[PDB]
């Protein structure tokens, strides 16, 4: 039985496959052309 | 009879039965125009001198 994966290790291992690369997703970057000053107090 | 020299200008691979003769383009030191192709026993880097005991024989290329 090849054990399934969890970050904890409740069901099986804690380390992923050494060949596994999980490239985490970025957000949608908001960028202006007009300079905004974010001063508050 | 003469004993002549020749400098290795280019290497042309490795021939023989067991892969032991290095085929070499040598350049004479009487005329620096006159080139022949020569079979060499032993390790050869490009840009060293050989002693030719007969300066007439030119080897079979591929």
């Amino acid at each position: 039985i090849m054990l399934p994966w969890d970050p904890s290790g409740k069901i099986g291992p804690k380390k992923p496959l050494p060949d596994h690369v999980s490239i985490v997703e970025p957000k949608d970057e908001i960028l202006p052309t007009t300079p905004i000053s974010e001063q508050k107090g | 009879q003469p004993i002549k020299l020749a400098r290795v200008t280019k290497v042309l691979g490795r021939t023989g039965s067991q892969g032991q003769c290095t085929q070499v383009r040598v350049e004479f030191m009487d005329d620096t125009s006159r080139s022949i192709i020569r079979n060499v026993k032993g390790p050869v880097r490009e840009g060293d001198v050989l002693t030719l005991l007969e300066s007439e024989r030119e080897a079979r290329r591929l």
Partner: protein, 185 residues
């Protein structure tokens, strides 16, 4: 000293490589002229690192052969020392110059190869290797079951081989190979 690094008590300069071919593959001079043959090693990592190794060290390493003498470099540096002191008493010349001419006048210029048996030319690095190897083997056999010691046989080999005296084991093997190569050239 910045004057001259004398090989124990021997000369560095006035040691000419009088052949215009083997001048690269003979290390005796200028950058490789040291107090002893014995080095760290590391000349057997790449292909053409073995040529820059000093010949006193090459002839040192070549002299420890046939099982019982394997890895006795402290014995062989001492054999070289004794056989070098002997040459200066017997010849009247720097033993390095007598060695240089012995290596140069021993290396065979042509050889035969199975392509059928065809004569080929010989590389200058093989000429240095075969010259050193034939001289050490001649010294090795000459001092076997004999009262004449190894340094006495080694010096007698290098004097006869510098002269081309024809009593050398190295010259007789050299003249054999060049004649046998010429037989099928």
């Amino acid at each position: 000293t910045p004057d001259i690094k004398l090989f124990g008590k021997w000369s560095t300069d006035d040691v000419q490589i009088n052949d215009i071919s083997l001048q690269d593959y003979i290390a005796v001079k200028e950058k490789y002229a040291k107090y002893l043959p014995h080095s760290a090693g590391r000349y057997a990592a790449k292909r053409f690192r073995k040529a820059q190794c000093p010949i006193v060290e090459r002839l040192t390493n070549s002299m420890m052969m046939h099982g019982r003498n394997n890895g006795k470099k402290l014995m062989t540096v001492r054999i070289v020392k004794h056989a070098f002191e002997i040459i200066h008493l017997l010849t009247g010349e720097n033993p390095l110059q007598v060695l240089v001419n012995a290596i140069i006048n021993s290396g065979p210029r042509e050889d035969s190869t199975r392509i059928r048996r065809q004569a080929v030319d010989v590389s200058p690095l093989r000429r240095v290797n075969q010259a050193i190897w034939l001289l050490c083997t001649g010294a090795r056999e000459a001092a076997f079951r004999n009262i004449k010691t190894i340094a006495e046989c080694l010096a007698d080999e290098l004097i006869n081989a510098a002269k081309g005296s024809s009593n050398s084991y190295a010259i007789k093997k050299k003249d054999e190979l060049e004649r046998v190569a010429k037989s099928n050239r």
